[PDB]
Symmetry: D2
Subunit: 253 residues, 4 copies
């Protein structure tokens, strides 16, 4: 029987996903990391936090492959205690809604919304079949402030994320008797790899107070929030949405 | 040069769409009705209200065909003043989220969400190219209370309608300078064709106070609301969402 | 028996309230206008729209006086079909929350929230006692975009308006069986050179001032009966200001 | 120069407040407890968790006394790192809105809304004047699911809590630059007769009573600093009760 809880972090080898994986490992979780390709240096780095880490190749959009991925995780770890739905993408192209291509809408919906929904389904079947439950359990979905704030130049992104908000509410109800805490986390403007030109612009916007807290969010901010929710103290808060955005999404006049 | 405003009502041959069509005709609109299935009898009947009525055979999900449908509507009427996005479907199968099939999710998302988005895009291209704007203009999207209330046995439906909520907010911003009023109407429990068994069960629930107003919604309720929004008096309320549910979606304890 | 529906518009002789009164009169309503002081010129202008108009002196904050006001309206008109809760005030002082004075918080809560709640109570007692219901009935409460958008320099105003939002939801449930449509209307930037530039610069997506007539047309739509099954709905009369955008 | 952070928990002597105080002391906070009524036995027992505990007699509604209470807390502890606005009351009478008394509306608004706003103002003045910031800082306001779910038989309660929701949003903006995390926690049906049957019948999706320790665990999580970038968030501590379901 497992002695550490197991977190499956989709898209966990870079960016926000990696910040989440690091926070969870530090809190005492073992880690199943998925992505289209691995990074062995990152897996090694995560093992340095003192737990077990394994990588599983998965395309989130390829829903026919999800059950096999879940079985691989089960075969390696025995069970799943926390799912973090982090994998996602931005819009393929930004621009006028009038120029939005159905093909690009499809690509993002298939990843962010359809893929996440069915990956979650596959994991939940396994969680509901677990013959023992020794750790707090959770499903934490990383959507976006774009779930609730609209950006007309990228409505495909916004719609895909708003879909997740609705999904999470239903999922919370479905899993309430099983005592699996179901949460949404909405990141705002989180630091990414950037050119000086772009970073200087964002920094001026942030310092100007676009973000009330007047700083970049870090992957570690999202990570600490997620690890907080995964530790079990928020079980009775199932269905809650947390905005990891420095106050960006506060409606202000 | 048209002397009456033109409303394009998708799915306008039956049910809520027909109620909306009747109400708009009574207010003085000409009507362009789309549906996948022909119904000349209903078109004939609508002509009794004194306006022009024309039918356009269209499958909402067939996005590659939308430009041609819009071109046909322009050829018949010269312009479009009001779009009512009413066409849609319920979930193919209701039941446990764990049994939800990707193919059924895709069917409903392709109709309710993808189809509506790209049909709207085709219409909006036409509207923004109009060389005369003599009438109030609007886009009224008929979503559902399921946009904001979850039903775990049909999350595909809820997700599709929540997506529309997000879309409507962005669309309202896109069209604000063009003075096209953009609204969401969320129907609740509206009378449909039903067996005595099912109708009796719903009547008991409605009378018990599931619906605070303790009556069925009628297609004419949704029609009267839409015709009010389409008349121009709500232009400055662009981005508003109207329940049409007898209070069903009021959150109460 | 009355042959025209009766609308009671609080704060109805100036500004948004007067736009609402004008729209309702043009739609065929008789008008009971309240305010702290009359303007007989305005009352005369409203009579030009072809109905009955009467003024009733009332301080919205003086809740002990509300029943008498409602009786006066009933004595004049026989019944009330539409209440428009328009009367209100802005914050006494704007500035840092750290400097907010309890007495100023009290002034605005007593008017916008407490006064409205108990005036509504008085009117509703009368509506539920009516022996005839020949017209569509409604209660339309004019709150603000500040019900849902926060302004830290005037949190007393924001809190007062958010309170009304909660009140309207409850009221809608209370009155649903009686088929009294209950609605919230949230005005944005309604009609200066400073505001012009901000509006032109796109703070308001529609890029224009709201007019009292915008709010009036919306209210008159709701009061006409076609929105009865949409009870509990909120409409924002703000040119898109309150759409959450990034 | 303090070596442990300080949490001021209003109404901390019993119920949810005591569950919050316990969770915070277990996480390493010193405690300033307020209540209108003393209970030295409870204070004594809290010291068993190993931190400093002090009591300050305070009536949340008595806003003229708040600066003195905060001065006393500063005299004892040197600063305040976490404020938990827990103190509050239910409606004096539950019943038809038509029977709601202004006197009762005033009592609850004075405690839950006005008292909380101005007690927070006093604490925030102290926080913003601090010469040292060695610990994560937060203001966690305990409202209710009634902030967003209406109950027509107690609209005074609902309105008071909705007013807090709006307050928290503005407060979060005001304090964001200062990196004080500002949060709302909305308790559902917490164990403090009909209800036990309703919970069984599925009203609460998780099908159990909430405990004061549920709310306490949530608050201690928020107070620990890891949620600083989530300022403005609302957490519903209700077993899924407020999820809008059809
Ligand atoms: Cl994007
Ligand atoms: Cl369905
Ligand atoms: Cl103001
Ligand atoms: Cl209560």
């Amino acid at each position: 029987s497992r002695q550490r809880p197991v977190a499956l972090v989709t898209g966990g080898r870079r960016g926000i996903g990696l910040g989440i994986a690091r926070a969870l490992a530090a809190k005492g979780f073992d880690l199943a990391i998925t992505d289209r390709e691995s990074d062995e240096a990152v897996i090694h780095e995560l093992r340095g936090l003192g737990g077990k880490v394994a990588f599983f190749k998965s395309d989130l959009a390829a829903v026919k492959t999800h059950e096999a991925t879940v079985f691989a995780v089960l075969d390696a770890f025995g069970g799943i205690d926390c799912l973090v739905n982090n994998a996602g993408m931005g819009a393929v192209e930004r621009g006028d809604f009038l120029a939005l291509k159905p093909e690009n809408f499809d690509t993002i919906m298939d990843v962010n919304l359809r893929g996440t929904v069915f990956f979650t389904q596959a994991v939940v079947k396994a969680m509901l079949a677990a013959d023992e439950v020794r750790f707090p359990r959770s499903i934490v979905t990383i959507s976006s402030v774009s779930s609730v704030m609209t950006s007309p130049e990228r409505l495909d992104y916004c719609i895909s994320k708003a879909g997740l908000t609705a999904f999470v509410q239903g999922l919370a109800l479905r899993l309430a008797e099983a005592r699996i805490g179901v949460f949404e986390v909405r990141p705002g403007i989180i630091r990414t790899d950037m050119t000086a030109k772009v970073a200087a612009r964002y920094d001026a916007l942030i310092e100007g107070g676009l973000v009330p807290m007047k700083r970049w969010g870090e992957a570690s901010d999202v990570g600490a929030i997620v690890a907080g929710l995964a530790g079990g103290d928020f079980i009775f808060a199932t269905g809650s949405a947390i905005h990891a955005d420095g106050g960006l999404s506060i409606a202000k006049l």
